From a paper:
Functionally, 3CLpro recognizes a hydrophobic substrate residue at P2 (usually Phe or Leu), a Gln at P1, and Ser, Val, Asn, or Ala residues at P1’. NEMO is necessary for activating NF-κB during the canonical NF-κB response signaling pathway, which is a critical first response to viral infection.
To explore the molecular basis of this interaction, we solved a 2.50 Å crystal structure of a SARS-CoV-2 3CLpro active site cysteine variant, C145S, in complex with the human decapeptide substrate NEMO226–235. After extensive co-crystallization trials, we determined the structure of the SARS-CoV-2 3CLpro C145S variant in complex with a decapeptide from human NEMO at 2.50 Å resolution. This structure shows the Michaelis-like complex of SARS-CoV-2 3CLpro C145S and NEMO poised for catalysis. In the hNEMO peptide-bound 3CLpro C145S structure, the asymmetric unit contains two, mature 3CLpro C145S dimers. The hNEMO peptides bind in an extended conformation, similar to an anti-parallel β-sheet with 3CLpro residues Gln189-Ala191 and His163-Pro168. Our structure of 3CLpro C145S bound to a hNEMO226–234 peptide identifies key structural sites required for substrate-binding in 3CLpro. Thr26 and Thr190 form H-bonds with Ala233 (P2’) and Ala228 (P4) of the hNEMO peptide, respectively.
Author numbering:
A (entry chain E): 226 to 234
B (entry chain B): 1 to 221, 223 to 305
C (entry chain A): 1 to 306
Write the structure that this text describes.
């Protein structure tokens, strides 16, 4: 549903 | 003999991948000479992602906040700026494995190899196309941000893609290496939609020529005009074929002695009457992620 | 998310590829430490190939009958030996780009990356399965011999394949890096033929699981089958028999999705008996069998709740 900016944590 | 979806050899690009970290936020960067390029959303926390003020968030950062690792080795950041949706982090060491390279903005329907990276470490490599709707159909998990798409043009690495985001439909969006987005997409975690997709007609024609080069002839037959072909092409949601498309399918046409318009007639029938439990080059669909030069590289055994 | 045929990064292997020339034959070698490994058919003339006595042919050769090039630099050959069907060329310099590596033998149904090479230089990298009949469906042209198949685990390269030849049906045959052929093949010029191929069932099921994780459900049904009832359909359509080891290795994908393995088996039976009817699965109109369960989890990276 929402765009994901594909950083890790 | 045989035909595979073939990626470029990746070793030149593997020596350039590094891990960029801001606080707890981590992604990948591209170490070329004494600059590390990476997506700007490395400066975001999970709660900044809705509509970040990049300009403000950066003013708040110092060189010492950006932790850069190339394998085990630590790289001192000595300078920082933002160009569109990329950070450029000046570091104190030039990458001694910088290949000859350029930055190119590629056209929809062009292919490239993706080196998927996690924690600054290459994990996988696969061939991709810039779809007409400016998205790619990738395989990317969280942490893949900063992974790059590239071509090898003779002796020179052509960087054409840095990975930023996954859209809701599961397709992928990113920038050229000058931080500009392919398509109308922004680096915000918002409800963004892809536009109407289309089959890359010139690629499908290039693949049928590969099938003929490899001794597959069953779909050759009738001869059509350019305008009659395109009436059919767009009912099937194919890109209209231009006279420049016909021009660049010239080498393949000459080599096979099949006139481009005779191959358009072949395609027209396949679109209308289907593949009827047949296959072409191991596939029971019409493949659109082989460009003309892609077919020549694999079929003639071009090395780098 | 998304799902692609994904090769391992080829860098660690590229740094080991050399060109070996003996007489009028050129192919690829693999340069690890002070040895170059290549197919031993490099020492043979056309006449020799018809009935090669490799022991007798190799003792007749001098170190200088072998021209080894690492890009622009000739490697000096200081010794030659033979292990099964691979030629080990001892060279005066150790490859300073030799990665951490092991030689492994893979089983039918397992996958690896191929770095297709000519004149010691890389053309490209793709993913393959060892077929049940011990052939690979590669993309290989004249001069590809010595090209290797590999998997990468952390920093360690597992070399599992060296390319030797092409069979009449256009499929490919080769050895491990200890030089034993996969399958009943010999490196002499006699009539040889691939056996009956079968589809790798466990891999097609691994692939159906990947389709569901990536959003696809059209091909699911409320039915289920016994291992025995499925294998009667498996045989009809020339699939490998499914075994409890296969059902065990799918268990993690089964858990992640909540689709029991004999349920997915019921999906595959209907898919075999009806076809897809103009519909696609993960961008393919065929049932895909060159993704192992391992390969699905590498890209799907699911959690298993306990």
């Amino acid at each position: 549903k929402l765009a994901q900016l594909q950083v890790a944590y | 003999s045989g035909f595979r979806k073939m990626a470029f050899p990746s070793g030149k690009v593997e020596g350039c991948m590094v891990q960029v970290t801001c606080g707890t936020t981590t992604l990948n960067g591209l170490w070329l000479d004494d600059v590390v390029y990476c997506p700007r959303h490395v400066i975001c926390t999970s709660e900044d992602m809705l509509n970040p003020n990049y300009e403000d968030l950066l003013i708040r950062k110092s060189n010492h906040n950006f932790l850069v690792q190339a394998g085990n080795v630590q790289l001192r950041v000595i300078g920082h700026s933002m160009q569109n949706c990329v950070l450029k982090l000046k570091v104190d060491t030039a990458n001694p494995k910088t290949p000859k390279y350029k930055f190119v903005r590629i056209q929809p329907g062009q292919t490239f190899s993706v080196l998927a990276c996690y924690n600054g470490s290459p994990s996988g490599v696969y061939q991709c196309a810039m779809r007409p709707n400016f998205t790619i159909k990738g395989s990317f998990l969280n942490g893949s941000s900063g992974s790059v798409g590239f071509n090898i043009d003779y002796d020179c690495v052509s960087f054409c893609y840095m990975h930023h985001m996954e859209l809701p439909t599961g397709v992928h969006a990113g920038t050229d290496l000058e931080g500009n987005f392919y398509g109308p997409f922004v680096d915000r975690q918002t409800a963004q939609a892809a536009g109407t997709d289309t089959t890359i007609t010139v690629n499908v024609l290039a693949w049928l020529y590969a099938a003929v080069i490899n001794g597959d002839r069953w779909f050759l037959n009738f001869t059509t005009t350019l305008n009659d072909f395109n009436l059919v092409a767009m009912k099937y949601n194919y890109e209209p074929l231009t006279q420049d498309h016909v021009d660049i399918l010239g080498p393949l046409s000459a080599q096979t002695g099949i006139a481009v318009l005779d191959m358009c007639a072949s395609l027209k029938e396949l679109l209308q009457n289907g593949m009827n439990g047949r296959t072409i080059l191991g596939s029971a669909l019409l493949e659109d992620e082989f460009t003309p030069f892609d077919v020549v590289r694999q079929c003639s055994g071009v090395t780098f």
